[PDB]
Enzyme design. Structure first.
Site, PDB file in Angstrom:
ATOM      1  CD  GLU A  32       7.048  -4.285   8.559  1.00 29.79           C
ATOM      2  OE1 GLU A  32       7.705  -4.886   7.722  1.00 29.79           O
ATOM      3  OE2 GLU A  32       6.985  -2.947   8.625  1.00 29.79           O
TER       4      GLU A  32
ATOM      5  CD  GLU B 144      11.214  -2.979   7.224  1.00 34.83           C
ATOM      6  OE1 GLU B 144      11.031  -1.874   6.627  1.00 34.83           O
ATOM      7  OE2 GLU B 144      10.453  -3.985   7.059  1.00 34.83           O
TER       8      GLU B 144
HETATM    9  C1  G2F Z   1       7.621  -2.256   7.539  1.00 33.15           C
HETATM   10  O1  G2F Z   1       6.659  -1.991   6.499  1.00 33.15           O
HETATM   11  C2  G2F Z   1       5.558  -1.143   6.848  1.00 33.15           C
HETATM   12  C3  G2F Z   1       4.608  -0.989   5.629  1.00 33.15           C
HETATM   13  O2  G2F Z   1       5.354  -0.469   4.508  1.00 33.15           O
HETATM   14  C4  G2F Z   1       6.080   0.202   7.370  1.00 33.15           C
HETATM   15  O3  G2F Z   1       4.970   1.015   7.750  1.00 33.15           O
HETATM   16  C5  G2F Z   1       7.023  -0.064   8.571  1.00 33.15           C
HETATM   17  O4  G2F Z   1       7.523   1.166   9.099  1.00 33.15           O
HETATM   18  C6  G2F Z   1       8.186  -0.928   8.109  1.00 33.15           C
HETATM   19  F1  G2F Z   1       8.940  -1.206   9.225  1.00 33.15           F
END
Ligand code: G2F
Ligand code: G2F
Ligand code: G2F
Ligand code: G2F
Lengths: 483, 483, 485, 485
Positions: free
Chosen positions: D383, D204
């Site tokens: 994710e 991200e």
């Molecule tokens: C994707 O989202 C989650 C929840 O906000 C985060 O904990 C991760 O680090 C992120 F990559």
């Protein structure tokens, strides 16, 4: 602003059983309703709340204070009832064939009224005269209603009937009640005609028969579940109304009406318009066609026809209906069938009683009555269970606006009487449902002005929804309320 | 009833930036706050709401209507500010050593004031004179405040500072601002002393420094996170207050006070009493000990001592604190740190802004100030974000009762000014937080009376919480509200 | 970890009327309860929901699938009833003085049983045998209960009684029902003893009498409001239990108990401990003292025909009842226990179920140990569960209550099993289908069964004979913040 | 049943900073993020929660237990990162013209790698090898990601930058970071290629740049509000990805992708379909067109050094964003997607999570098929999950999103796995520990892991390679009536 005709009056409605008791000396133990709410088995079943009307707001003793507040609020009309039981607490001598279905005539004359005079409680009569005189002295136009649900115990023992025993005084199931009601009505008009402006015979006879013999979970007397007996009760109350009308008119030239419970029937989908009409027939027209047109079950009774000068429209909310194979059904989650202090299936806020905010329904109901019968109307009951006063300012202004709408459309509506001036005993629900513009502290009997009372004073004194409060013609914001 | 002294006045407070704009011709683009809320990056970050003050309630044009309503409401006092930026939109010639930490004296005399006169916007001055004359004509006692947050852009470019660039006009970080504020204050008093009853130098200087340089999530300018700079800003504002006091007094004999943001510090457990005292020191006493006693950081400055005649007490809610190893901490879930339209950790209802209902705190705050300094007070700000008006009737009556309590205990409190008469621009939050006794339709600028305005009229016209509204001295029932 | 004795079984309880119907050919129109829920006046009054049992989960036809899922879940015990009405849909010959208050003996012998056999529905009998054989084939220990509320219509016309007409078949108001129930129970034991491990006579007789004749807003038959008739019905039900115990024992050596509805009585304030004892007396002890000790009121007597008619106690439990001391005695308080708003929070801030029942697992420990200390009879937890279609609370409800049984055993109480109510959603009486108590969710259109996550949690418990370390956190109150208030 | 291809794997994703610390000796104080969350001014402003990562779930020390639970759950894939800071806690020698805007090549050779090896922390390297070997020993396929937000402090002092001081190490604002990231990625690939199945360069990057320099209320470092610097950081991150791809490829033949944050852009009204395309352009396509097609703005050019640097796309997804057409362009609407109240309902009546994120599984189908249709590169859902300590919504959230991946495959999209966020609760950045995304609940006092019922549901899915018939009902919206509004 929304200005009302110069003759239009704003005021309030209240009932004797709900408001009178609470001051030592006011106790009236002699009704079916009194016995019903004190009954051990009814209390244990939760059919009644366990609250008792002798712990009430005390209008019997404190009426001058009620009237003081009403006057300060700018009110110009009041509708109240006398309690039959107070005037005739003891059985009257049997007159008349009790097995006859129809009661087409009840002979009333001066001698008969003097005879009735000898059974009447003079203390009760004098006290009511004192209340009503004080009422008139504040410039309040007076609608006197004869009946608002409790019957003398000598005419109805509701516990016997609940138990399935029909050998005792059987209330609206007996033509004796019809006969005595006609005489009671004539008698009261005879005694009070100098103080009264208009008469109503009864308040919401449809609720008495409906909840008494079908909606038995409501805890209304005598709570005996029977379609057949509900029909018999309604048949009797219809003839009682007509005989009371004739009895009053034998003694007075003043207008005689009736006050009735209404919902605005609304279609679930655009396919349900026929369902609405069937609901309106079953819940409203059949009754009014009987006492206005003499039509009943299909014949015409000449003794029923034309016994009505005006219509008292009570209204709280809608009932949503849908077309069914066999007919139609009402839907839970709307109107009076919602969760308390929440939101309906349509996202509209509900009251402390679980009734949905739907002011448009009042315009529907007023214009439907007007278009069918062309009799003038008063809105004789309209308000909300709301101890906190969160919704009442909106509820009040919105419904008053709908009355203005109805008049604008041509309907002859001559007043708006809020339910109620102060908190009172809400039947099987007890004191917890608080409908007053004034809050009652039941410990001290003190009256307080909820902010809606200040809003109502603005309306009543101005004869208008003023510019400054016009925003209250809207739905209470639901986001800050409980869901 | 709860009756107030005959000299006690009820009224309202309002701010220029929050209420003035909205009528074509009223636009004041020349402040740090104006630039700040129009900033593209601030909008994208959500530091500001995106609402703009030029779409506001329009007091600049519509003041006569505001005043009409205030008069009808029975109000007898008003506190407002002039906007510095309106009177001096253009930079003034540089006077004075800017590297000097302390500003102990600002020489003001008749010639200097005539010179300032030549830079002043006469249209702005004449308009304010017209507003204030109309105010006085309604019988309103007038507290004129000099400062309620926005600075002329020529004294502060907040976006430069947000970006970490300190070479430009730096607002309260610069003694130039202190010097010019003292002169501005003297000048306004010189021009308006015939209309003014009492003066305040500033509104809530603790919020300017606190949210400007520490609470940066609040979206207050210049939003540069620095303990050091917050201290420097507060140091300057303290000397600005003292120099403004001297400047006003060189030109007027009338009382000069200050208006300050307060919370009532409350212990989480009975073990946290020391935490409360430390919180009160850090948030309140250090500031007032500076301008009343001349005590600062630990020396005494003779140029600071005794520069205060009265204390304006602003109050909304409590702050709950607990004792910690290193000191103390404030707790989320109470006071101003609750969820909006819900209930706190203690079960008390919260406002549209998430602030907990806690009127007892006002009595705490008034009596603590009284006992420490024995200077008379006005409650200069108190109210609730509540568009629906569900809680405001209770909030209003309860807090007014606490003021009566304070007076009863011996505290010299001379008025109560509700925040606010009408809805206005709530800073970084925009228009959605509605504090008015009057609801504003921002499309038409029309004002409506919420039922609390009717309640306040009862209080103000009677000089008392009357018997009839005394029940509102209680917590809004939470059961019907959102949790 | 919270480990249970090696002999302890986890399973489920189910009722015939609530679960059997729903498949073609399963309809049993011949009970008081069937007539009651189809009654037009009851429906119009809202006493009953308008939902109908013949649209149910279909255990009659789909029992093999129910049992497949129970076996997959690691369950090792089941408690089920036969419906009286299915076995004897038509009246039996009048036998016996109906005016006599007491029924001290009901003679049953092999010849009598063979005569009864001529009147029994053989299709029903054989179908039940097929269900029970399949059940035993999964390794499920079998508690057979004789009665779970509906009576054959020929013994009770509830509409007639609702209307205040006592000339017809009057259910528990008649000693004929008592006499016939004894015979029925002996008969079922005689026919099924090879399949049964233990017997119960009845399920929650206190609810039958209490809601039938006092709590009339509940919409239970015959819904005739009478303190006096409630007492008469309870008196008859007590003697019917004793007579059924003797009847079963005439034909079997296996243990015979009863299943009873319980709440944990809790004091509002520390001044209300006497109120609790009085409520325990009035709601619990009076009944069990009659059937265990023979003590009763008719004055206060000992009946030798009642004494000792109980081998074990089935403990049903959902929640508490909070009571306070009164001038004249005691009262229970709204806003706690089963008197809360649905999907909300109680006055104590504890979450409530889809039925408005407060989360209070501690009460199960109270009830189990109190029974144990009074009577020292072994127990099964025969009913425990929650109305929760979403399955939000059930994982916590299940683990927490199972933990409280572990606690009770640890304190010395002999508790031999835990039977969840229920394996699958079913017809919740006057409430209809909307109240869903299943570990498995039922789609009532297709009759398909789905595993709610709580069912996976239950499988962990049952297969391990323990609350395992991994699910131990569920021994806690469902978080209230994300739930409705 | 919804069955997945035989080759499809279910697993989980995890980040180093969020999960590693919590056991004695696991502390990594040497990142921008560590300094950022300990900063007194940030804490006083409420930009960060005050919770500290060194009190975390302890994966550094307890990895064997994490892996035991993942194996029990039937998981077959894991995606994890190495923390740059742990390998290179101290600065490396300056190499290269820092004033040059573009970084088109970073030469890395075996000798260079051997020099880098002299500076690397060997304890950290060996520990990661032990973690990864244990991981592979459970039969987990391994996606190694190089970066998941924290930079070594010697490359970024975020407090200095927050204060508007650009003279120090400036993180993604400097091409030095780009140069070093390339070397770092080549280096890690060189050391770990025997253990890795596929690589991701970054997690991200759009969040790093977006929240770092625009969404400053989120409390992400360096929290310096600047459109211009956000664009500069994104430009650098894009070239760092390309340079890291070449670096890895210089040393390995294995697939190299990137993981990116997505929302499904949805039109408010039927008049807003253009608004959606514009939002998709601005939030998604501009980035992937740069690293796949080499298209970028500096005017609109093609960089041959950027074109083709991607083998696969990691799709992260939680919820939608609702957009409406505006005079000047488009805007996103509050009250939907990630802009809702916590534990409530959106403007559309859909339930929201502990984080205030709207339930909208359909959006995952939208995102997967849109990527597939544009680029035709295979994907992993890297994710997907929900903040839900109580586990009320997660069973529905899990089943529903897994179903939408089945849908995407059915439509022809090449999707090779689903990795839930996360196996266990962990440190949620500026929000701290209160946001709990785990299939397993962490007790942060004992570091013990508990199976929430959703973990049992996930085990059913993973062991069967399908949404089985028994849990299919969870492919639905959590009932809103029993939840908070
Ligand atoms: C994707 O989202 C989650 C929840 O906000 C985060 O904990 C991760 O680090 C992120 F990559
Ligand atoms: C009309 O309705 C109100 C509210 O239920 C009652 O109190 C009155 O008695 C009835 F007439
Ligand atoms: C006092 O508080 C109110 C509410 O936040 C503000 O609008 C005023 O400007 C401040 F002085
Ligand atoms: C125990 O309680 C449950 C839930 O109310 C009922 O369904 C059973 O029939 C009763 F035995």
């Amino acid at each position: 602003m929304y200005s009302f005709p110069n003759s239009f009056r704003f005021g309030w409605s209240q009932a004797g059983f709900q408001s009178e008791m609470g001051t030592p000396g006011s106790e009236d133990p002699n009704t079916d309703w009194y016995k019903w709410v004190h009954d051990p088995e009814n209390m244990a079943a939760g059919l009644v709340s366990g609250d008792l009307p002798e712990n009430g707001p005390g209008y019997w003793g404190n009426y001058k204070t009620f009237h003081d507040n009403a006057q300060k609020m700018g009110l110009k009309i009041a509708r109240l009832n006398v309690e039959w039981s107070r005037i005739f607490p003891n059985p009257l001598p049997r007159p008349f064939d009790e097995s006859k279905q129809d009661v087409t005539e009840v002979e009333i004359n001066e001698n008969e009224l003097k005879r009735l005079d000898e059974y009447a409680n003079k203390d009760a009569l004098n006290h009511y005269r004192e209340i009503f005189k004080d009422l008139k002295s504040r410039g309040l136009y007076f609608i006197l209603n004869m009946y608002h649900w409790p019957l003398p115990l000598w005419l109805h023992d509701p516990i016997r009937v609940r138990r399935g025993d029909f050998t005792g005084p059987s209330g609206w199931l007996s033509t004796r009640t019809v006969y005595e009601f006609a005489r009671f009505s004539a008698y009261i008009a005879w005694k009070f005609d100098d103080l009264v402006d208009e008469y109503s015979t009864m308040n919401e006879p449809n609720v008495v028969g409906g909840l008494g013999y079908v909606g038995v979970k409501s805890g209304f007397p005598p709570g005996y579940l029977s379609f057949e007996l509900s029909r018999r009760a309604m048949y009797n109350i219809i003839q009682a109304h007509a005989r009371a009308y004739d009895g009053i008119k034998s003694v007075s030239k003043k207008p005689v009406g009736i006050i009735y419970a209404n919902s605005s029937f609304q279609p679930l989908t655009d396919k349900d318009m026929e369902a609405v009409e069937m609901a309106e027939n079953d819940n409203r027209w059949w009754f009014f066609d009987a006492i206005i047109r003499g039509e009943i079950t299909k014949i015409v009774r000449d003794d029923l026809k034309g016994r009505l000068d005006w219509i008292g429209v009570n209204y709280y909310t809608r009932t949503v209906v849908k077309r069914t194979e066999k007919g139609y059904v009402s839907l839970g989650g709307y109107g009076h069938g919602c969760e308390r202090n929440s939101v309906s299936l349509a996202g509209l806020p509900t009251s402390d009683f679980g009734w949905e905010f739907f002011p448009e329904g009042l315009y529907d109901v007023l214009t439907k009555y007007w278009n069918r019968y062309h009799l003038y109307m008063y809105v004789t009951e309209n308000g909300i269970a709301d101890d906190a006063d969160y919704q009442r300012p909106y509820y009040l202004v919105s419904h008053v606006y709908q009355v203005h709408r109805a008049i604008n459309s041509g309907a002859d509506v001559r007043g708006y009487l809020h339910w109620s001036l102060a908190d009172n005993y809400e039947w099987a629900s007890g004191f917890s449902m608080r409908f007053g513009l004034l809050k009652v502290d039941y410990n001290t009997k003190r009256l307080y002005w909820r902010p809606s009372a200040l809003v109502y004073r603005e309306i009543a004194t101005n004869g208008a929804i003023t510019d400054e409060i016009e925003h209250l013609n809207s739905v209470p914001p639901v986001k800050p309320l409980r869901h």
